[PDB]
Design a binder for this molecule. Sequence first.
Ligand code: ATP
Length: 248
Amino acid sequence: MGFEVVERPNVTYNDIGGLKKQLQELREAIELPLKHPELFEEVGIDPPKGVLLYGPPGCGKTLMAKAIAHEVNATFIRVVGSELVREGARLVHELFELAKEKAPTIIFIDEIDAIGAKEVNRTLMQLLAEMDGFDPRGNVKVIAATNRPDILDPALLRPGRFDRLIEVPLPDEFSRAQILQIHSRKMTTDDDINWQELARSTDEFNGAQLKAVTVEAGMIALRNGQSSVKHEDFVEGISEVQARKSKS
Ligand SMILES: Nc1ncnc2c1ncn2[C@@H]1O[C@H](COP(=O)(O)OP(=O)(O)OP(=O)(O)O)[C@@H](O)[C@H]1O
């Protein structure tokens, strides 16, 4: 095993709420040079080998990464940084070898800070070696995620590495309403549902907690033997997810 391999992920840009601007930057960074690498050679600019997504948990970094891979017909391989801390230089190598074999590939490195906090450590040094190894205009791209871009060893941020940075922030009020709608699409909801009030009531929620709200709302409707989900069900679901946060 070692790291998640997904032959072709079934996630699209329509599954992502809000994030239009940051999704566009990532598409311009990875999708454009994959679909039309010849343009980047004509103009004489090396596209980025690594894109670092940063921001708080559950705001859709992983989503975006899977969605890119889908659009561009690539394999998606995921490693978790905290799992790479024990060996593991060997594992980073096997990762990039496989990724080349199953190319086109999108490598997603979660929690990169676990490995690259600031003659460097042996696992981190493999990541550096592997990225200097493969060339841009090539068809293996790396995407990394972290809370703390400030705590990263500046060696990761040097040219030819993760020299393209995108902030993936908490959803704004409009985004939150989209996120709830998106995760309610498979589920019959009343016409009388006020998505925008629900969005006002979820100040500081992330995408994962908004999805969880949809899930509890659906579960409350079930326990009540309803055949559709009511506004008051979403309001109780918000209240439940807020309770769980408090129970870290
Ligand atoms: N903008 C969004 N639109 C739709 N769903 C979202 C969004 N953000 C988060 N979610 C939901 O929450 C779940 C977790 O999100 P995701 O794993 O992408 O967050 P993250 O930024 O990768 O956090 P981390 O990598 O630190 O765990 C996803 O499965 C997704 O379904």
